[PDB]
Amino acid sequence: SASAVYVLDLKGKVLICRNYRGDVDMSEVEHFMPILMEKEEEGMLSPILAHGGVRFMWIKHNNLYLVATSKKNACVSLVFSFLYKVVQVFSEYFKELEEESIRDNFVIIYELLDELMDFGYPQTTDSKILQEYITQEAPRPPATVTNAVSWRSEGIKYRKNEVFLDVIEAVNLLVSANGNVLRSEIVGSIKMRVFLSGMPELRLGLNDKVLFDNTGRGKSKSVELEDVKFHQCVRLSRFENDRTISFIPPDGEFELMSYRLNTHVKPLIWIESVIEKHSHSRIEYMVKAKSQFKRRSTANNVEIHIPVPNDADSPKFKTTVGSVKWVPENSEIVWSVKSFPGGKEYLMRAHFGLPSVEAEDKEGKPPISVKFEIPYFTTSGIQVRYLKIIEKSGYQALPWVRYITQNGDYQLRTQ
């Protein structure tokens, strides 16, 4: 229940503001910057600010803080969801999120803000629906918003019915300094870019453990996602009733389902680091990377980031496979490898000097993270069974899907 949502700037200037209830004065935005500065200097800065009896909830955007001032005890989660929807709509309409587009599309930006929410209650949240009624280059509102199906616009015609799916896998491993993995969770991502004619109702079917157990086929390799979230077009009733993933696919790229469950398998890449750091004399980087993934899968664009000393200079890299580049801005050395086949063993030996004068304050030990991304690999083993594409007119669809395995929160605690 934010009183007014406004877009700020890096210098405190409000790029654009739009009051929705009028219960909060527009002059409260000026005091938001001093409050944020005081909070940052004291460690008490939070996204939800508080200016007396009015709370100024702000979200750190790409270039401006989306401050949504509120007065009463409005839904904080609702305000955050509205801000996220507004950010997504702006990203869809404008490819750049900065001051260049804030002051360049004000005529359409004001109309979009007015149409999105009224009296603090959001009304329009579909990017396609908003673009079909408000454009920067007006007819009556589309019937899709009024109709029940607000995620599948009717009347869409295409020459070919091709849908491109993406089995995105995020391998996150939380390995402590002792060598044991604490947080090892893999989050699935079933995103399909449906581009067909009409409003087909997708019938999602995969090798789900629950579905296999219900059907009596709980003996093969089935993916048991701890948390499964359906898309907006996905009908929750069918999933709760018999796990039937039946919903109208959206026009374009959208996230249908996103699995999320813990992983009990060995890490895809095993990286062991050795720190032979002398006392203000030199530093040793005994970094050894072992590929725990299958040899048939290659980790393309593998970049194992090893944090080097903050004051370290004149470093020498003695590795075997993969180029090592030291970035002064990042204050770390990334063991970048173009192609990392499974089972490969890469050994590196870093050596650099240190300044004679000791550092005044400590810099910490940031965890070492790798950027391995091996496509065409299904670590979870979940295989899609079928995709029920049904249309009233009747057409032969040719859906496609690709499985991509990447490294997410794969951070290894430093020694």
Partner: peptide, 18 residues
Amino acid sequence: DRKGGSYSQAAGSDSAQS
């Protein structure tokens, strides 16, 4: 070709489930 795994054809439903 495409990085991150080549696109593969998908079926319509579980033919073995009737």
